[PDB]
Amino acid sequence: TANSHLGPLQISLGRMLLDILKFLFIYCLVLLAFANGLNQLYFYYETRAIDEPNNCKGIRCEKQNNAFSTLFETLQSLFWSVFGLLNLYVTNVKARHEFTEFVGATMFGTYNVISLVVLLNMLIAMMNNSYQLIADHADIEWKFARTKLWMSYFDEGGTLPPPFNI
Amino acid sequence: RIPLQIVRAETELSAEEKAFLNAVEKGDYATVKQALQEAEIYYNVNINCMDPLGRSALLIAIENENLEIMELLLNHSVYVGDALLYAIRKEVVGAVELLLSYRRPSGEKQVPTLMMDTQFSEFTPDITPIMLAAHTNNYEIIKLLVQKRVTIPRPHQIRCNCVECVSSSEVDSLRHSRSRLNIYKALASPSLIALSSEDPILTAFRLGWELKELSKVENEFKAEYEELSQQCKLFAKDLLDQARSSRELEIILNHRDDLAKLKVAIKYHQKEFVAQPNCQQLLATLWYDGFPGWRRKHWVVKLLTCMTIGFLFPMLSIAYLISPRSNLGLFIKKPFIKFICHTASYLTFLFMLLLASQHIVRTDLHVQGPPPTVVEWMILPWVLGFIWGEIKEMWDGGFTEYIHDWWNLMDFAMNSLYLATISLKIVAYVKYNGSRPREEWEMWHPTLIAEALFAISNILSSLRLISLFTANSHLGPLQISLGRMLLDILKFLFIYCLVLLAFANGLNQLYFYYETRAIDEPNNCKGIRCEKQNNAFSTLFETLQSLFWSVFGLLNLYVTNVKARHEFTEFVGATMFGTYNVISLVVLLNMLIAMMNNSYQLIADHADIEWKFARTKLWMSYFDEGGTLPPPFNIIPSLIQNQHYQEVIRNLVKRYVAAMIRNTEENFKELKQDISSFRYEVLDLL
Amino acid sequence: TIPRPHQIRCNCVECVSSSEVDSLRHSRSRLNIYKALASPSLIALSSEDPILTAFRLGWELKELSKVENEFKAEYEELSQQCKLFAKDLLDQARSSRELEIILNHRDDLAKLKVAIKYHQKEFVAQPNCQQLLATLWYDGFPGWRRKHWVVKLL
Amino acid sequence: RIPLQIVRAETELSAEEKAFLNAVEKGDYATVKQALQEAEIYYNVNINCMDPLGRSALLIAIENENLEIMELLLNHSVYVGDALLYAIRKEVVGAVELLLSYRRPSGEKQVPTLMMDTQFSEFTPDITPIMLAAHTNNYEIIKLLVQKRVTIPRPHQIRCNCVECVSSSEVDSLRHSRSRLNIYKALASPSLIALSSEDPILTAFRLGWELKELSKVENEFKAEYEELSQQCKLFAKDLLDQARSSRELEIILNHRDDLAKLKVAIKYHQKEFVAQPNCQQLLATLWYDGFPGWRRKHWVVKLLTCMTIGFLFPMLSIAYLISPRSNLGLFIKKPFIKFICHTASYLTFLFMLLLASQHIVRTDLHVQGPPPTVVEWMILPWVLGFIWGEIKEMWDGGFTEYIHDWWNLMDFAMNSLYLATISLKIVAYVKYNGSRPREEWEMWHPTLIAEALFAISNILSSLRLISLFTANSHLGPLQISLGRMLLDILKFLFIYCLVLLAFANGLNQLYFYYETRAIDEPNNCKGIRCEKQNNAFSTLFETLQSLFWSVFGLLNLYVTNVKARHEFTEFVGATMFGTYNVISLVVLLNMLIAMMNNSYQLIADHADIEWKFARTKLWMSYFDEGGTLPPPFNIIPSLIQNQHYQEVIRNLVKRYVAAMIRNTEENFKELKQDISSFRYEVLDLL
Ligand SMILES: CC(C)CCC[C@@H](C)[C@H]1CC[C@H]2[C@@H]3CC=C4C[C@@H](OC(=O)CCC(=O)O)CC[C@]4(C)[C@H]3CC[C@]12C
Ligand SMILES: CC(C)CCC[C@@H](C)[C@H]1CC[C@H]2[C@@H]3CC=C4C[C@@H](OC(=O)CCC(=O)O)CC[C@]4(C)[C@H]3CC[C@]12C
Ligand SMILES: CC(C)CCC[C@@H](C)[C@H]1CC[C@H]2[C@@H]3CC=C4C[C@@H](OC(=O)CCC(=O)O)CC[C@]4(C)[C@H]3CC[C@]12C
Ligand SMILES: [Ca+2]
Ligand SMILES: [Ca+2]
Ligand SMILES: [Zn+2]
Ligand SMILES: [Zn+2]
Ligand SMILES: [Zn+2]
């Protein structure tokens, strides 16, 4: 708020953060639904850490282990798939159950299509519209925030810095 | 240079006729009276003479609103053809009164014969005075015309196949379309609806629905039909807005041919009528029937009451079963308690579906036909209650109304998935006895198919919670914009499916000779779902899957490499894959972003009205007594009204007419004409 | 005289009885009373402290718009009208002494703190109040806006 | 209930005073004359009495424009204080003439004494009549005031540190700011500039620049200063637009204190003046000096002429060196041929830099200090010519003008890189004799550093071609929008750098205990640039690089895994990395997209004007004779004008005044007043 260029930017950031929260509610609901479906489909094929290479179990290995074995692991794997850090061979099982693998791949593809084609672009559209409304009033609220910050230092309470106030 | 000439012959007006028309334009009464008195004796001036702009003396008198010169030109028996149309379009009450009242008296010897004045008419020949008065929307002229026993032709059905409509359309389609549009414009005026209809609200609703259907049918004239439907809807909302007491509002809403008129408005898609503030207040009062002052409370006590009433789901439904006339059983009949109990039941079903996917209950997975666990035995009554509720919703209300909701498709899909998984489980129990290990099971095992359908049904059950977003005040317009953008996403996905099919066909046709067997490849797997990505363009299905997965970047770049050193084919395939990637990631997705962005801006202004309409549709679903019990418990075994409505509509019509009466170069010309006429009369008298 | 509106969270017998008997008449009467009280002319003529009265009426209208869902728009319009009336009355000053008298009046900058507490962004963001706050902010550094940026950064 | 009372005492007007004010409002001359004649004998009515709204009888006469009642109230010696301000604000020429001319005659015995009328003044006490007339922008009142020997105070410098300005700012800052704003508003009126300045264009340019600098300085009053600068710029463009012949335009542009006034307009950033169509036509005619009818031609012959003149780069510059007075040497002095030759030279330099990176020329890479290849020997004269051209541009024009271009920073960087690579090459030649193989070279070898600087200079030389986009008609506004969005990208990248530094500090503080040596890890490499991604959060620089590369998805997920089984630390680091990814890929990038989207919509309306300004700035850079030779060849060793300008500005001022003269409830009140005054006089006479 002290600078004359970074104030309205963070005011628009504050409005768009509320819009991001309104988006993230629906995203959390969709993520919970798809994580429940993926865990219910894939939790029979859980393997122990000793059988897998390098004695590790999870999506944080060199070779990506069972990603849909638990609800927490399924939630982490569905979270990391938005940024593309989850590979495609996590939906493959040891046995040759082609129908279950195809159904899980369809499930993962539908979640990817939703969270990367509908939801993120809708969030972009919402925060775009919000900015246009925010810009006309951006100055007044920036001046109000700067006035609120300026009068916080007007009083004598808190003259000393944090290293010297004690 | 370029010569210029008058291509089309306009006859020049004589000096006397030009002076007479100029005197009529300036409003000099004495000179016009002298010219009219000299016209009969000497025949010098044709009184019905036109001007360069197509107006006669009578039309010039009408446009300047000189009633004195108007009656003086009428007294000498000038031509009067179509002057009433100009008076009605000018919205002059006195001119319309004079033209109506003077045409009858003192008609002697037919009319004086006149020729070749009748070609030029600004108004179309199909037009009649009552229809043009309806288009003008003036009230007094419409009233004076309706008092003289005037009628309007009835338009036919849109899907009319009689001989006369087809013959008129074939002979002259333009005249038929103009006549139908003029008739519907005359019928859609608020003044004619207020004056010639005993039920203005229902007439406005039916006219708005008919105009919307005509706009859907007639492609050429869509815009004015949409404007007429919007005008009828705004007239209905404005007539509803003129109420002054709660008794008048409840009389209007509860009038029948409980809230019958609100249901009729919802059936005709009158969003402005439903979303009016007083109707919303009445629906809020009916919705919070047993909880007075709900808006007053701080949010912690409201959330605590919601938690204590949602956690009390298994009671208050058996209490209704055992004692519906008791004090405790009567609390479930209120709509808010019904909605909270249904939400608590669905949340309990979702939590039970989460609990079914845990290792505490699931044991002994190496059985071919496994008996259902106790969690499944308890989940089965909820599925049966959902089936009974969906079939009851199919029966009550009709099959023609069950399909218009658009949420029933997911319910039908969920019920089909539950029936399929139950049938697969029972068949696996009955004829797959054994304990074979899962690693050597058949790929087409009904247990695996039943579990896959169960997982898809669990996803649909968890995604069913989006429909409850209308209840909140923040998630309603968000999903309305989501619903519009989903249609825009479908319009995008058509072109994306076409481009994907084209590139998949090209890639499969290029790469299907180099298919390899699973034994030769490492780890005995074949497809894009391996640790090392195998042949991705060997089949049409595999090519479609590989081109689908390349949008999210999960397909690597070495899938376009073959075993042999065919560098040209590899380069051509890499160019093909790169062109598909450039299209689907630089043109199409950004165009989809631009389309849904534009749509949101249009959606936002109307977002509230439609959110209030959706919330009103959700609120009245719980008003009726059909479906009081939850899904786990639903399977357990008079002319004074018309007179008051007429009184209220009478007062509302009077108030709306007063409001609309309360709410350009022609105008200043009146002031020049009034000043000029007063100046000539003062000079003449003095 | 004009009747006094009740509290928004009013639970007396007469308000509840009027709401139950005829909610539309009660809502129309309350909206008409608050529209009458929110006019700038009546505030200028019948209030000894127009700025504080406009601030309180704007805060009450904003809270009523937050409470009453049906009539949100006209209550927001009334709050905006009261805020614009307060800013327009502040804008009519002609000297620095009048501005410091208005800002420092108590029932140091008490009225500015009262405006900030009531969320009067237009009143706080007026140019003369911003100039006075800038002068108080650069108390020991006269002519701070004058300087080239290198000496300011140094 | 609530009692209501008049808090502030307004004295009620008596019956006679109220009747007198009502008679003055209705314009009845006889009743007002009778009341004024009875006022002296009986003293019944205070003629200077006010009303409830703060107007007197004279102000009511001024507002209704009743000149008769105005002079009648003046004849009885009413109070006249500040009435001239109301007349000037009302823009009544006759009222201003009457108030100017009546104040002098018939003043006897001071004025009659009057008290307590003087508190209420709508106009501020600092205001004077000439200043308010300048604010009103009326021409006749300004002319009549200027004829009576009236002056305006001179504003001080913005960076004024004298005693009186500082004392006035300290004593009363609001009065000083209002006085300065009123003075600059008075000086910025087009009528005062046209009437009181011998050079309206230069005065408007200086006033616009001063108003823009004041808007940059004064933060509180930025908007009206920007409006005043826009008004001055539009006045200058409108005065330029009133020309009628090419000789007047060339007289205006070529007037000095060749195109001196165009250079002065460019120096003051008058984009509207430069982008006028007639000045653009004159600049296009001067630009295509030797190619008449360039716009006429089909594009194939234009491209063929461009190719044949761009391929003829090595001739026509040596011809200028050997025979500047010849027919062939004179063709290089035209601006279009100069621009095409410079573009051909830069394209040849870029093509030579492409050819330098081929295996045909580069041989024997295992030499420590390699001699320069023949391609480098030929490229060296181009670098020397670029150095000589940049230093010549530094000398000519001044050091204060060389830094405002903003393209010279890349030229300075390119010259520094070329000097550094030449120095590294010469030092490696002089003291690194040998043929050691490249696999065992020092990491700080000057040959490798020289090649890295050469590659960066080659990138800068290839990216220097963006500046030529102003010449085309399609790539100019695109790069103008790119320039605005680059500033918006910088405003985004500040917050992104802060967030990146915070998350990098947290990740390094969490993960720097688990650093491993390069010998223990596979392949003897350590960092995120291995086949297997090594420790990515071991150092602050490595953490910054890893967090930078995670935005594009090139950083894998197993970098947050440690050797030991510390599951809590790994989960905390994964949560940290996920939170940084969610921020930098869901909030920040989409917010940057929204910001640059909004900016483009604002940029598009003005995109042309600024593109034409940039093209005009590029065109006049080649007009002068300084820098005729290309970079490869530049190192090879009078009062009639003022009278005509005054005549043209005189005709332009007259035409602009005629144009501005050619181009509400007060108005209708005049018509009610004129009708009411005529009605009373007719009734009185009759
Ligand atoms: C860009 C990278 C290196 C991160 C830098 C982090 C910090 C060193 C930055 C982030 C925000 C910066 C602050 C942003 C704004 C201001 C106000 C600025 O003063 C004004 O704007 C003058 C008017 C006034 O505030 O009264 C003085 C510097 C300061 C404190 C900055 C100091 C340096 C800060 C703390
Ligand atoms: C955020 C993560 C943990 C997913 C949460 C999923 C569900 C537990 C959520 C999704 C939608 C929620 C519902 C959204 C809206 C409402 C309406 C709300 O009531 C109102 O808005 C009051 C007005 C009225 O509806 O009459 C009561 C809670 C409820 C049912 C919510 C209950 C909890 C639900 C089902
Ligand atoms: C597209 C790929 C192959 C990169 C090409 C790089 C260069 C060869 C391009 C980039 C910008 C181009 C220039 C952009 C604009 C112009 C102006 C153009 O002339 C006009 O627009 C006529 C009007 C005028 O400038 O007077 C002549 C070609 C030229 C110099 C272009 C020459 C070729 C350039 C240097
Ligand atoms: Ca249903
Ligand atoms: Ca340069
Ligand atoms: Zn028919
Ligand atoms: Zn009360
Ligand atoms: Zn000074």
Author numbering:
A (entry chain A): 498 to 663
B (entry chain B), D (entry chain D): 17 to 273, 286 to 665, 706 to 731, 739 to 761
C (entry chain A): 167 to 273, 286 to 332
Which sentences from the paper describe this structure?
Like many other TRP channels, TRPC5 is permeable to Ca2+, with little selectivity among monovalent cations, and functions as a thermosensing channel. Here, we present structures of the human TRPC5-Gαi3 protein complexes using cryo-electron microscopy (cryo-EM) and demonstrate that Gαi3 can directly activate TRPC5, increasing its sensitivity to phosphatidylinositol 4,5-bisphosphate (PIP2) using electrophysiology. Remarkably, Gαi3 binds to the ankyrin repeat edge of TRPC5 ~ 50 Å away from the cell membrane. Electrophysiological analysis shows that Gαi3 increases the sensitivity of TRPC5 to phosphatidylinositol 4,5-bisphosphate (PIP2), thereby rendering TRPC5 more easily opened in the cell membrane, where the concentration of PIP2 is physiologically regulated.
Even after extensive 3D classifications and particle sorting according to the numbers of bound Gαi3 proteins, the four molecules of Gαi3 from the fully occupied TRPC5-Gαi3 complex (hereafter, TRPC5Class1-Gαi3) showed lower local resolution. Moreover, when we performed 3D variability analysis of fully occupied TRPC5-Gαi3, we observed substantial movement of Gαi3 proteins and cytosolic domains of TRPC5, showing structural heterogeneity. Therefore, to deal with this structural heterogeneity of the TRPC5Class1-Gαi3 complex, we performed focused 3D classification and sorted out approximately 30% of the TRPC5-Gαi3 particles with different conformations in the TRPC5 region (hereafter, TRPC5Class2-Gαi3) from TRPC5Class1-Gαi3. In contrast, we observed substantial structural changes in the cytosolic domains, including the CCD and the ARD, when TRPC5Class2-Gαi3 was superimposed with TRPC5Class1-Gαi3. First, when viewed at the bottom of the channel, the CCD was rotated by 45° in a counterclockwise direction in TRPC5Class1-Gαi3. This rotation was accompanied by the ordering and shortening of the loop between the CH and the CCD and the rotation of the connecting helix for 5°, thereby elongating the length of the CCD by a single helical turn and moving the CCD downward for 5 Å away from the membrane. Second, the ARD was also rotated by 8° in the same direction along with the CCD. Third, the ARD was stretched out from the symmetry axis by 4 Å, losing its interaction with the CCD. Fourth, we could newly observe a strong metal-like density surrounded by four His735 residues at the top of the CCD, which may have contributed to the stabilization of the rotated CCD. Finally, despite all the differences mentioned above, Gαi3 was bound to both conformations of TRPC5 with different relative locations; that is, Gαi3 in the TRPC5Class2-Gαi3 complex showed a slightly longer distance (~4 Å) from the membrane and was located closer to the symmetry axis.
